[PDB]
Amino acid sequence: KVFGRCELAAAMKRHGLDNYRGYSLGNWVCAAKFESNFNTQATNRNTDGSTDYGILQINSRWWCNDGRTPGSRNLCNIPCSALLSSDITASVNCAKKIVSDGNGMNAWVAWRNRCKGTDVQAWIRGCRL
């Protein structure tokens, strides 16, 4: 599913991301924009052989099982294919675990490089929330 900007903002808020660990909703929307262009089916292979899955590009080295990432963990206890669903629940739940892990949203390199410190409230502007 390709979300619209406000549609994803609303959905993220419904699923508990609105200021989760102190990150305002526009941070999450901005991260999803640059990780996946709001496409739940986005996948991208990493140099280390791991793969990133879904709207927030969650990686198989640590967080999900895809059966092809040697020496990896599955800390969210989910198949990585769950992260590609039209329903964002697995992605959101796993993202809450990631952002709680010590480095906050810096875990998403696209968020650090393209969202951090910018006017992220722009990403929810105009949206009925």
Angstrom distance (rounded) from CA 82 to CA 51: 14
Q: Which member of 11, 17, 20, 52 binds Ru ion (CB under 5 A)?
A: 52
Region from 9-17, 27-35, 60-68, 98-106 binding Na ion, contact rule CB under 5 A: 60-68
Alpha-helical regions (H) of 15-75 = 25-36
Position of minimal CB gap to Na ion:
72
Q: Is 52 a catalytic residue?
A: yes
Residue 69 contacts Cl ion per CB under 5 A: yes
- 7, 18, 35, 119: the catalytic one is 35
Looking at beta carbons only, is 40 or 69 nearer to Na ion? 69
First to last CA, the chain: 20
Residue 121 contacts Cl ion per CB under 5 A: yes
Region from 1-9, 20-28, 89-97, 115-123 binding Ru ion, contact rule CB under 5 A: 115-123
What is each CA distance from 101 to 62, 69, 75, 96, in whole angstroms? 11, 21, 11, 9
Q: Is 18 a catalytic residue?
A: no
Q: Which of 96, 95, 90, 92 is nearest to 78 (CA)?
A: 90
Catalytic residues: 35, 52
